Design a protein around this ligand. Sequence first.
Ligand SMILES: Nc1ncnc2c1ncn2[C@@H]1O[C@H](COP(=O)(O)OP(=O)(O)NP(=O)(O)O)[C@@H](O)[C@H]1O
Ligand SMILES: [Mg+2]
Lengths: 247, 250
Amino acid sequence: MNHHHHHMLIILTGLPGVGKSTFSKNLAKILSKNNIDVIVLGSDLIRESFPVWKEKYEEFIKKSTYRLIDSALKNYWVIVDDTNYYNSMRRDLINIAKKYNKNYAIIYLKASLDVLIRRNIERGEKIPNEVIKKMYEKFDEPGKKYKWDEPFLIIDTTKDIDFNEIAKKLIEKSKEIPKFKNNNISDKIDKETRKIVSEYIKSKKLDKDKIKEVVELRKEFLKKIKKMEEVDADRVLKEFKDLLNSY
Amino acid sequence: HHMLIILTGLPGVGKSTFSKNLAKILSKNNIDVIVLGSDLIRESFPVWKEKYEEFIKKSTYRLIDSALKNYWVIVDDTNYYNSMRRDLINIAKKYNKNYAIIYLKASLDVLIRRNIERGEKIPNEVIKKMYEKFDEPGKKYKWDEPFLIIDTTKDIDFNEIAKKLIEKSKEIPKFYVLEENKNKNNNISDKIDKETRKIVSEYIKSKKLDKDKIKEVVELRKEFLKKIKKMEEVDADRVLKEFKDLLNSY
RNA sequence: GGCCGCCGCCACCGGGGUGGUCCCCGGGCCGGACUUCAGAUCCGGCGCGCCCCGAGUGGGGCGCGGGGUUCAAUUCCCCGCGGCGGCCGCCA
RNA sequence: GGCCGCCGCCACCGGGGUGGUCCCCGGGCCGGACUUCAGAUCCGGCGCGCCCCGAGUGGGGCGCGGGGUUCAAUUCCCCGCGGCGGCCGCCA
Ligand SMILES: Nc1ncnc2c1ncn2[C@@H]1O[C@H](COP(=O)(O)OP(=O)(O)NP(=O)(O)O)[C@@H](O)[C@H]1O
Ligand SMILES: [Mg+2]
């Protein structure tokens, strides 16, 4: 262009402790080195702004986190640092991308439940180990249900991560193009002639060669009519009925 | 029921910490409070750029805005300028919520020391100028007067501050108590007022009264209007004539 | 900090009116009189500064940013300070 | 993860329609008028399998996932194969 390139929305998905926040910062840092304005957003920003947790804050948290992401994707790349364990959650974020016609990439961060538990402890078990175990089970494997849900990259956070390799791949994708009546006159003659035939065939017991003859007659009739300029169904449909009765 | 708390103080003064400790106490006092500041969105970017500031400011004000409709909001920001503090106040005014500016101060010596302990991400030089040119709140506008001034180098009784803020939340805001065209006396009573008033002005001129007798006439009208507002059904014309006559025999 | 608009500079609080030394509505508070008595209520009142009188308790006078008009300015006119709204400037 | 839906299996492609041996709309392509070249316009036509006739660079026949309803299915119903989506599951 200016050979083209643009900006997009990155959706992380993975369980607690898997490495989303850390991954985000690193991915974010490399993208900067690439003259790309990127910001990292997640529900935890607002959730942890409350001194304590209450189920009743979640509606504000989710709605607030979506506005930030929405208004951010208008100017910047956005890395959504969130678990997003339900596919419907990922769809919601994708809709924001679609809303602005931007590309999107779902990045799945994986780790054995063994590692997740170990890590959850190292942190203080603020989330019950039992909770980490259930979530691990309930997790919606990305792409298992919908094609739009297929992960752009699956990443094992138990091994090294080539943030340069990843940044490159994302940038390449950002250059791609995100793509995400009433019957007329001729249509009436078709629907009509067809009915007329149905009627005629039920009216006279006829031989096999007879049915086929009628059917061919209709075909020729339609052909001739698409030829004529101005035409009226009542006039023509009558001509058809009469031609049929002469057999 | 609920208000907007505006913190103001130089970098390293202890805002973030103060915020979190004040919030925790408020929660114990069954108050739904959230802590918001421009650093939340600013630090979400991997690097800093002057061109982000407009988005950061805009985004942060929207968060505080929509949060103040349901929760107490503690604005954890330097708010170096009173113009910023005014901006935050107008958000409070917009929902007719009470507000309180809490000023946190510490000596330049402490600020410099703290800034180092951090990593000097902010040039000492900068901390100094910010400190030197920083104008304390309330020196120019009364609405900018801090509700409390807290020295972070000394102990801080959070239960006290909380108890104080809660009392203040119950008070009535005074932003919109500037549009109360109510309690007007019926259009007729108001006519008698406006008319007797003119009738007196005419009388005073026609008899070139002195300061003394003028005051008597003024008092006479006061007594007249008092008596009239005690009557049930009344007609201006009849009443006004009665006043005129009264004055004429005076 | 600037420009534009509107408002305040009559004095318990809010609003309103108004060429009458302020007034009205709404709210609050203060003092006197209320049968050797308390007490709702009726009568008077409400800020600050200066001055004067009074033993004191207390009472009275002048003033309310500057200036004009006028017998008289809270009101009308010119300026000054301040508030609110709008737009801009500022915004490690 | 639960519940459910849509499109294709008529045949150049996509969308829509329909118990008539397919039709309509839009796009593309081959052949003809057309003859520098291209264009406009018009005309004829467009897939696969197996088989018969002729053997020019030709014509014809049966079939188009299985079953059913039927004279007739692209259409309606059951299943199969294929392509895809929707709602809800919400710090966990
Ligand atoms: N790539 C990594 N390899 C090993 N450990 C990591 C990695 N990244 C992060 N960790 C550690 O794993 C724990 C959680 O990491 P974090 O990146 O915060 O995961 P998260 O998904 O963001 N957590 P949460 O926000 O609670 O869902 C901390 O001890 C991290 O330091
Ligand atoms: Mg995290």
